[PDB]
Amino acid sequence: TIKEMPQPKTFGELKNLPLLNTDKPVQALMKIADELGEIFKFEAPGRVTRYLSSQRLIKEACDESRFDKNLSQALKFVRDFAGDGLATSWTHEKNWKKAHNILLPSFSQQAMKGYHAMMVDIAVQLVQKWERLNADEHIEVPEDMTRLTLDTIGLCGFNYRFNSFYRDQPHPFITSMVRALDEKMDENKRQFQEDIKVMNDLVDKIIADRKASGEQSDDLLAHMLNGKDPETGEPLDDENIRYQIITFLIAGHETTSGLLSFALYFLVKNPHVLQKAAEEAARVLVDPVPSYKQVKQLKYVGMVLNEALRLWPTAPAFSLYAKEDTVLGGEYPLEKGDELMVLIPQLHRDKTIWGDDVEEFRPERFENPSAIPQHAFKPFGNGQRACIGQQFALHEATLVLGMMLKHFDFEDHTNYELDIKETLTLKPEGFVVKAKSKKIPL
Numbered sequence: 001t002i003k004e005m006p007q008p009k010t011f012g013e014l015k016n017l018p019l020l021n022t023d024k025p026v027q028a029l030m031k032i033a034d035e036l037g038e039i040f041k042f043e044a045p046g047r048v049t050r051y052l053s054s055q056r057l058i059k060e061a062c063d064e065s066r067f068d069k070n071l072s073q074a075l076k077f078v079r080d081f082a083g084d085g086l087a088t089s090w091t092h093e094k095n096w097k098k099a100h101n102i103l104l105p106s107f108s109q110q111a112m113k114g115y116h117a118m119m120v121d122i123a124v125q126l127v128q129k130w131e132r133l134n135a136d137e138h139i140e141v142p143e144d145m146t147r148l149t150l151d152t153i154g155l156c157g158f159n160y161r162f163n164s165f166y167r168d169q170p171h172p173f174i175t176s177m178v179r180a181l182d183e184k185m186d187e188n189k190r191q192f193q194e195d196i197k198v199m200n201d202l203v204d205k206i207i208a209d210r211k212a213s214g215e216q217s218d219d220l221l222a223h224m225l226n227g228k229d230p231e232t233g234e235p236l237d238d239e240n241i242r243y244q245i246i247t248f249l250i251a252g253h254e255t256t257s258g259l260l261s262f263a264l265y266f267l268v269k270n271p272h273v274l275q276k277a278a279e280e281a282a283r284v285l286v287d288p289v290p291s292y293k294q295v296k297q298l299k300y301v302g303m304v305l306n307e308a309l310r311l312w313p314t315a316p317a318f319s320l321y322a323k324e325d326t327v328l329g330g331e332y333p334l335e336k337g338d339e340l341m342v343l344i345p346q347l348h349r350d351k352t353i354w355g356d357d358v359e360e361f362r363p364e365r366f367e368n369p370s371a372i373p374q375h376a377f378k379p380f381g382n383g384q385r386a387c388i389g390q391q392f393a394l395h396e397a398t399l400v401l402g403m404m405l406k407h408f409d410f411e412d413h414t415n416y417e418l419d420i421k422e423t424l425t426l427k428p429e430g431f432v433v434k435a436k437s438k439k440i441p442l
């Protein structure tokens with residue numbers, strides 16, 4: 001029997017559109033969800049979508065025979081730069097499945113072992129930076145985590161060194177990336193087009209240096225350049241290879257920087273959790289450099305990372321459309337092409353799944369993950385359109401956080417007040433700490 005969806009306050013002909021005129025629209029959508037419940041309609045001139053918050057409804061929306069990935073307004077904009085790269089292609093575009101099949105083997109267990117030494121190269125630069133600070137100096141947490149994650153995808157994925165740790169100023173790639181993208185929220189056209197040229201010359205250099213190289217390679221770039229899809233039998237064409245390089249250099253670092261920064265925020269705010277994870281790191285990381293196998297034994301560090309993704313998943317929403325007319329939850333009829341948005345932070349606060357203490361930071365929720373019902377925990381998206389870089393993000397973050405907890409004690413010296421900046425990702429803006437060295441050599 002059919003139900004009418006709640007809707008938040010309207011503004012005449014503008015409908016709900018003005019609720020999004022805020023620098024924190026995900027946070028404002030979470031509040032609407034606390035007020036309206038598991039589903040609400042959100043209308044704008046010429047548009048409608050439905051925001052989902054409960055596991056009981058999201059488990060249906062994750063049914064791939066009924067719903068496929070939709071390009072959100074944001075992906076539609078990013079598409080101007082990332083083209084039909086993995087993240088911004090429709091599932092039905094030839095190049096989505098070709099590139100999925102060609103690039104999947106770049107995240108196999110054997111590929112992950114291949115990347116480990118270069119992840120260590122970066123993680124050691126981070127540890128050295130902090131070792132080298134003078135007394136009383138502090139650390140800008142998301143700034144340094146972005147330094148780490150950017151350098152990690154450039155080097156592991158492309159054998160390119162952004163050398164972020166030699167810079168106190170942004171890398172010309174990144175800031176060009178940002179102001180070209182903003183320059184479609186006279187003159188700022190030699191400027192926007194200076195930037196696009198920055199992006200294009202970097203992609204050009206990545207490709208050309210690989211070709212001029214006589215070294216054998218099995219990294220991500222090697223797959224883009226040489227791999228053949230077993231289905232079509234075809235390799236990627238030059239145009240799509242370019243889009244994939246841009247896709248992975250951005251998707252491959254921003255969300256991972258967020259996760260690291262929230263995890264450390266939650267550790268400093270919960271000193272018993274911090275002590276338990278530091279104890280694990282001291283017990284397990286018995287050598288000067290961690291090995292692949294040692295990172296795999298950092299069980300509790302990995303539970304910390306999942307509990308940080310539970311509360312602040314750093315790609316906080318994904319969009320879907322109905323493949324055919326269908327009824328959601330036995331209550332809401334949908335027509336072919338109708339859109340749904342999955343509000344992941346709210347899914348992750350569903351008290352029917354997690355119990356009443358949902359706001360508490362408790363990594364022990366992840367002790368027995370087979371206990372979690374289907375579709376309840378979704379920081380990496382859904383189905384065949386789920387994050388292809390999941391294992392890469394979690395290996396890098398477990399390695400790096402384990403090393404941080406081995407080498408330093410941390411102080412929340414400002415009593416930092418959580419302030420979450422929203423871009424394509426989320427981060428704790430302005431988060432700073434002091435790190436006192438434990439004086440353990442590398």
Ligand code: HEM
Pocket residue numbers: 069086087088100153247248251252253255256259313314315317318319379380381382384385386387388389390392393394
């Ligand atoms: C903790 C860090 C990360 C988070 C939370 C995350 C989250 C997500 C989510 C939610 C999606 C689905 C997007 C949608 O449905 O519209 C996705 C897709 C994707 N991610 Fe990640 N991601 C992370 C790290 C990475 C890394 C390190 C890489 C690359 C190495 C990456 C590459 C991609 C790509 C290429 C897709 C598109 C996959 C496809 O549709 O075929 N991500 N991610």
Ligand SMILES: C=Cc1ccccc1
Pocket residue numbers: 087250251252253254255256315387424
């Ligand atoms: C970092 C992976 C990703 C890809 C698309 C949207 C948000 C995050």
Ligand SMILES: [Cl-]
Pocket residue numbers: 364365
């Ligand atoms: Cl529990």
